[PDB]
């Protein structure tokens, strides 16, 4: 990330069929597969490197990234169930308690005697 | 500075005295005007105007020509006024680009009126020569706090809705006609048909691809 959090992202999607589809199956060419793979990975790399940690979480909440990938891959093939499967923290940068207190949202005592 | 009546390039100096400001212990605001020579039909009977004051609008142009006509017993009716971009927000026409500075143009109703007010300007230059107190005063439309807060005011939602609706209407109609004439199976006079791709919408855009 721009927050220097090393991350590994697993995302998945399915080859749906058309409304006009007379075929039982919905299978596409490996050319389409690799092209769409490259398109997806570009989208992920761009969005994450543009994002920070809390920004990535806020992006992650309302599933908007997979919709973006859907509208990108709208011309190649009709797809479905496009979903980021999994997130893997791999490295975390140095400690910042002030940043953690900021992203979460000082204290006196009670005079014991 | 008293006998400077005109310029040798045809331009005629036009003074305008100023009142006494409280923060300044009277100059003569100098303008210039010339007849316009242009092949445009709507740019006929017009005065090239130079060094206009702040907010030189149609009402103050009419006041100036009315003072001139009342002084010189003449008749000269202002029709319209053109090219008054004093702050310069229309130096680029980006709309048709992607689809005259500090001067203006003053249109009159006929050649009789423009020659008449031109003789009025000639006698005003002679006024600058001989009698500098007979020169006219330009009282600006002094922009106030009310005008600045009209600049600062929000827009009217009904106005927005109307302009948006009509703009989408005209843009949709012109884009529909563009899609039709682009993908309407064009053939040339000699037997020759062009090639046109799918979802392509503008012949100008085809020529820009060739560019």
């Amino acid at each position: 990330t721009s927050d220097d959090y090393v991350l590994r992202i697993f995302a998945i999607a399915f080859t749906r069929k058309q409304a006009n589809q007379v075929k039982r199956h919905s299978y596409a060419q490996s050319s389409h597969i690799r092209a769409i793979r490259k398109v997806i990975s570009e989208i992920l790399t761009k969005e994450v490197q543009g994002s920070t940690l809390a920004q990535l979480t806020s992006k992650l909440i309302p599933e908007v990234i997979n919709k973006e990938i859907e509208n990108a891959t709208k011309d190649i093939f009709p797809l479905q169930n496009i979903h980021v499967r999994k997130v893997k923290l791999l490295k975390q940068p140095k400690f910042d308690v002030g940043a953690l207190m900021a992203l979460h949202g000082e204290e006196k005592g009670k005079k014991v005697t | 500075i008293e006998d400077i009546s005109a310029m040798k390039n045809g331009f005629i100096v036009v003074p305008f005295k100023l009142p006494d400001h409280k923060a300044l212990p009277a100059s003569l605001h100098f303008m210039f005007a010339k007849r316009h020579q242009s092949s445009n039909s709507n740019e006929s009977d017009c005065l090239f105007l130079v060094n206009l004051p702040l907010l030189s609008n149609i009402e103050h142009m009419k006041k100036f020509v009315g003072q001139l006509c009342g002084k010189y017993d003449t008749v000269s009716h202002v029709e319209e006024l053109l090219y008054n971009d004093e702050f310069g927000l229309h130096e680029v026409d980006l709309s048709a680009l992607t689809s005259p500075r500090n001067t203006a143009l003053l249109k009159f109703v006929d050649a009789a009126s423009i020659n008449n007010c031109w003789n009025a300007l000639k006698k005003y230059s002679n006024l600058h020569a001989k009698h500098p107190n007979e020169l006219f005063e330009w009282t600006y439309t002094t922009p106030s706090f009310t005008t600045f807060v009209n600049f600062y005011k929000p827009l009217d939602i009904d106005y927005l809705k109307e302009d948006i609706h009509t703009h989408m209407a005209i843009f949709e109609q012109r884009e529909a006609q563009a899609q039709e004439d682009v993908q309407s199976s064009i053939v040339d006079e000699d037997g020759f048909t062009l090639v046109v791709g799918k979802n392509t919408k503008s012949l100008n855009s085809i020529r820009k691809k060739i560019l």
Binding site: - | E86, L94, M168
Partner: protein, 1054 residues
């Protein structure tokens, strides 16, 4: 050389004198003009049965000249001529109770007496100057300082001669003169006495051994001059630092450490500094060794001058290089605080030389940092200590200076310095990183007729006037609310015992929410002074002297010039609190969730803030319902999902943006009726006449602008670049430049600046002082806020050669010092936007450097672009620096130069801060002083208050301020002939009520003269001929009078 040869002839001419009693000696130096510089305490004739004797010494040399590594010192240097004593005049019972010291004193007195007699013989006295002084500020060891004035006139050489008096080799036992041993008998050890007498016995062996190492190596003299110039530009010296001075390490100690490192140095005593090195190699090896190896606390080094150097894991609680061949602790003249600050200087220099991308030769070796105390250290405080007299110590000092106290610190100077340092470090603890004192008023020079340096100023009888304390503060731990103490048990611990004995009435017993029990002490934060200031005041008023005076009115006035918002307990809120920022961000999350749950036929992609308060750099922290702030409406950029059916015309596209914002407005007026909304026709980008910012008012008292971005906007802007005409190019390039400046790199800028500001918390308040002072100098109408942000973060991200700023005044003088020393016409400017240890690569650095070369080839003076400000987010460096003219550039640079000259000559005081913060109001063609009829300070919310939004958004616009629109429209009209400047933040810059502005306008010197009357000349002129025209100044004057007719109060011309 010939001078020292003649003085050798003089000294061998000098006769001798025998064993003599104190009565004979005092009669001698009583009927002679020379007075014996007796070290304290003076010999008293009852406790002495020994006598004195001067015979011929043995003569030698030492210093950079004897090591043959001298430079041409501009201020002046010295060469040491040593005289070493006769051991036949010495006895074994001379190194206890100052006996050898008094022998030395009378030795030196007779020496300077008969040298004066031979000077009155040879008649060089008309241009020589003769005086007493101390060997590296050692009052227990006086010396001779021979200086000159304007055929032995060596005054043009800038050299002086220091006569040192030393004992022969192995006269007194070094194991008896170990620092753990006692030789002053009244039991505590005498460390300075042991070290000084042992060094006086063992000076010359170090010369021999160091000359041997210089002979064995090849670049020893060059590494010596490197160490010398580095220590000089850092502000170091070989002087005894125990007396309120910075020293203990200079050329001699540096060279001795080079010899020890060539002899070994490792824990395994292996060779880590090798003889085949070059000069850079030797310097790098010693600086790594000093950076990574502690000599003080947890380890120390040992070596033998006659055998390898081995590092052992016991630090003697002092910087410890133990010469076992002479049993000498080399670095005894150094304090622990001086040691740790030179260790951190070795560390910062190590990181500097490890910087492979950039060059660091200039900042390492060509910057003297000891010019300004406020620039070198973070915090500073003056403490007047009028102690009085020797007998009035006991009634002025809270402590006691007794016999063992005199044994430990023979000098009351070292005693008081040690006392105040330990009480300060104990009372401060984790809140500060490093602490230094300067006993202001200290001297080392005094004439021959005096026994010592006598002082009578500052309410004392000692060589000082007061004490200035300076601190390198911990930035994260300064603003802690409680000073933490040890825990509590039934049986009381020694640690909490000395804690309560130290803190007294501040000591208490406190419990917390986790259920922890400990002793603490209570403090109350202020917006005018730090808790650090309150606790240093309390500590030095309790445990040192009740008559002391501790202050810093400088940082008082800086904290006052920090703007004060109309907030409850804002007089108690200190500088580090970001609570209003957290409040605006929480309200922003409320709007975030409601607009994210709102529906529109196309999906909302991303809503992002680029507010200046969001990135924590608004001029004020915002107040609810204080909508008259210029930074009230924070910019919020919108992006929706990618549609393949966008209108591919620009006006239809921006009008579709208008329609989508209308849909947001109708649905929010439907389902979120507690919020107010309107549309504001934004036009801030030229030639786009359709922008609409959806302005939202929120009953948390806040307001925002909402504006749509699209890939379709970028693709049509690039289409405009493609189809614009060749001469219409650069104007449209400036338009797209401002577009991407306010849209595209703005989000990445705010993001990384929030991140790096949370790393450097103290950048957010120092930027608030910068644009406030810049507003008082009125250049805000031309400089961009994000560029100002980069200027303010530059000394934080590039602290070299100083430290990070941990305080407001330190950061402000650092940004002023950088802009004062900067030359934008030749020097480029690159930031590495990273946390403390995504750094910039050398290839990228060469790319942006070649970009700067291309820009400076196409524009070598800066008539198109003055400042080159680049980063990772800015590979161009033209993004936030475009649109500023060369007169404004020269004005701000001359402002920085006159600022550094003010602080140089007039020094630091409240009047210098006032002269900094007042405008100059000079070099202006016309000056219009205007007053808004209503003051806006209370409505803006700066503490000298609004409680709601009024019913009419037109009334909101009434309470907005129109002088900014005034000046910017005057600038759109007169970009051709004038340059104008104004005050943007009236609520902080409108006098007392917040209703005053000054408008400064400068003529273009081209339109100052006469020109040919052109159709595109575009200026109000008055023709001087029928062909040539001169500008119509009075027409301009009445025209601006009429444009601001209602607000114009007075007008002045040049």
């Amino acid at each position: 050389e010939k001078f020292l040869h003649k003085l050798y002839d003089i000294l061998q001419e000098i006769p001798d004198w025998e064993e003599k009693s104190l009565a004979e000696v005092d009669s001698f130096f009583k009927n002679k003009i020379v007075s014996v510089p007796f070290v304290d305490p003076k010999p008293i004739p009852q406790n002495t049965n020994y006598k004195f004797n001067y015979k011929k010494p043995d003569i030698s040399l030492i210093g950079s000249f004897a090591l043959k590594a001298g430079i041409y010192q501009p201020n002046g240097s010295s060469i040491d001529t040593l005289l070493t004593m006769p051991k036949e005049l010495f006895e074994k019972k001379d190194f206890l109770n100052f006996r050898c010291l008094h022998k030395r004193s009378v030795y030196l007195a007779y020496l300077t007496h008969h040298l004066l007699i031979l000077l009155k013989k040879d008649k060089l006295d008309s241009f020589l100057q003769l005086e007493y002084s101390y060997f590296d500020n050692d009052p227990l060891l006086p010396i001779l300082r021979i200086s000159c004035s304007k055929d032995y006139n060596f005054y043009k050489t800038r050299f002086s001669i220091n006569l040192l008096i030393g004992f022969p080799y192995k006269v007194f036992e070094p194991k008896k003169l170990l620092p753990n041993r006692n030789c002053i008998r009244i039991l505590p050890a005498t460390p300075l006495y042991n070290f000084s007498v042992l060094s006086s016995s063992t000076h010359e062996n170090y010369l021999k051994y160091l000359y041997k190492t210089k002979k064995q190596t090849e670049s020893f003299v060059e590494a010596t001059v490197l160490g010398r110039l580095w220590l000089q530009q850092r502000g170091f010296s070989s002087n005894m630092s125990h007396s309120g001075s910075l020293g203990g390490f200079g050329t001699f100690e540096f060279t001795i450490l080079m010899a020890a490192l060539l002899n070994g140095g490792g824990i395994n005593s292996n060779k880590i500094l090798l003889h085949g090195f070059s000069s850079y190699q030797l310097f790098k090896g010693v600086i790594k060794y000093l950076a990574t190896m502690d000599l003080c606390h947890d380890g120390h080094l040992q070596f033998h001058s006659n055998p390898a150097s081995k590092y052992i894991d016991e630090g003697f609680q002092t910087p410890t290089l133990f010469d076992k061949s002479t049993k000498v602790n080399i670095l005894t003249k150094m304090t622990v605080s001086s040691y740790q600050i030179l260790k951190e200087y070795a560390g910062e220099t190590l990181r500097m030389l490890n910087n492979v991308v950039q060059d660091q030769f200039s900042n390492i070796f060509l910057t003297n940092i000891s010019r300004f105390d406020n620039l070198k250290y973070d915090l500073c405080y003056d403490v007047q200590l009028p102690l009085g007299k020797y007998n009035n110590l006991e009634t002025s000092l809270a402590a006691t200076f007794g016999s063992m106290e005199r044994v430990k610190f023979i000098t009351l100077e070292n005693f008081l310095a040690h006392k105040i340092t330990n009480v300060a470090r104990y009372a401060l603890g984790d809140r500060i990183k490093y602490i230094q004192i300067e006993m202001v008023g200290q001297k080392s020079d005094f004439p021959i007729t005096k026994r010592k340096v006598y002082s009578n100023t500052g309410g004392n009888h000692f060589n000082f006037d007061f004490v200035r304390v300076k601190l390198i503060v911990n930035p994260s731990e300064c603003d802690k609310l409680v000073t933490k103490g040890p825990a509590h048990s039934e049986t009381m611990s020694t640690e909490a015992a000395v804690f309560k004995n130290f803190w007294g009435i501040k000591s208490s017993l406190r419990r917390f929410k986790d259920g922890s029990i400990t002793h603490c002490c209570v403090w109350s934060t202020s917006s005018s002074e730090p808790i650090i200031s309150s606790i240093v005041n309390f500590a030095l008023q309790k445990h040192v002297s009740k008559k002391a005076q501790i202050s810093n009115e400088t940082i008082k006035k800086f904290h006052n010039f920090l703007p004060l918002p109309n907030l409850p307990s804002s007089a108690k809120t200190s500088v580090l609190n970001l609570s209003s920022f957290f409040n605006l961000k929480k309200s922003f999350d409320d709007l975030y969730k409601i607009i994210f749950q709102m529906k529109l036929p196309l999906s909302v992609k991303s809503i992002l803030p680029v507010g200046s308060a969001f990135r924590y750099t608004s001029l004020c922290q915002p107040v609810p319902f204080a909508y008259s702030d210029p930074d009230f409406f924070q910019d919020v950029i919108l992006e929706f999902e990618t549609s393949p059916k966008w209108p591919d015309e620009i006006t239809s596209l921006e009008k579709a943006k208008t329609a989508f914002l209308l849909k947001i407005q109708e649905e929010l007026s439907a389902n979120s009726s507690t919020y107010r909304s309107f549309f504001s026709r934004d036009e801030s980008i030229p030639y786009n006449l359709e922008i609409v910012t959806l302005n939202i008012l929120t009953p948390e008292g806040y307001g925002f602008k909402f504006r749509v971005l699209t890939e379709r906007d970028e693709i049509l802007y690039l289409r405009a670049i493609a189809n614009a005409r060749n001469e219409l190019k650069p104007e449209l390039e400036a338009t797209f430049l401002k577009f991407t400046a306010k849209y595209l790199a703005s989000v990445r800028h705010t993001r990384t600046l929030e991140n790096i500001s949370h790393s450097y918390q103290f950048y957010s308040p120092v930027v608030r002082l910068f644009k406030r002072w810049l507003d008082t100098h009125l250049l805000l109408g031309h400089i961009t806020d994000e560029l100002a942000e980069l200027i303010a973060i530059k000394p934080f991200v590039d602290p070299a050669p100083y430290f990070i700023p941990g305080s407001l005044e330190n950061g402000f003088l650092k940004v002023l010092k950088f802009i004062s020393q900067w030359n934008w016409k030749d020097d480029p400017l690159i930031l590495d936007l990273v946390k403390p240890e995504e750094r910039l690569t050398l290839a990228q650095y060469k790319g942006i450097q070649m970009n700067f070369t291309n820009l400076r080839n196409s524009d070598p003076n800066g008539t198109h672009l003055q400042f080159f400000v680049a980063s990772k987010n800015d590979p161009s460096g033209i993004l936030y620096s475009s649109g500023i003219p060369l007169p404004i550039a020269t004005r701000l640079t001359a402002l920085a130069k006159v600022a550094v000259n003010l602080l140089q000559t007039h020094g630091l005081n409240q009047q210098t801060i006032n002269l900094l913060f007042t405008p100059g109001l000079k070099d202006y063609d016309f000056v219009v002083d205007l007053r808004t009829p209503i003051g806006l300070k209370s409505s803006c919310g700066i503490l000298s208050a609004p409680s709601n939004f009024p019913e009419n958004l037109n009334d909101l616009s009434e309470k907005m301020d129109p002088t900014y629109q005034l000046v910017k429209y005057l600038n759109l009209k007169y970009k051709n002939s004038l340059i104008l400047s104004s005050r943007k933040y009236i609520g902080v810059n409108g006098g007392e009520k917040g209703d005053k502005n000054v408008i400064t306008g400068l003529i273009k010197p081209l339109f100052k003269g006469a020109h040919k009357f052109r159709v595109n000349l575009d200026c109000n002129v008055k023709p001087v001929d029928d062909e040539n025209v001169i500008l119509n100044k009075e027409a301009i004057f009445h025209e601006i009078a009429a444009f601001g007719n209602d607000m114009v109060i007075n007008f002045e011309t040049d």
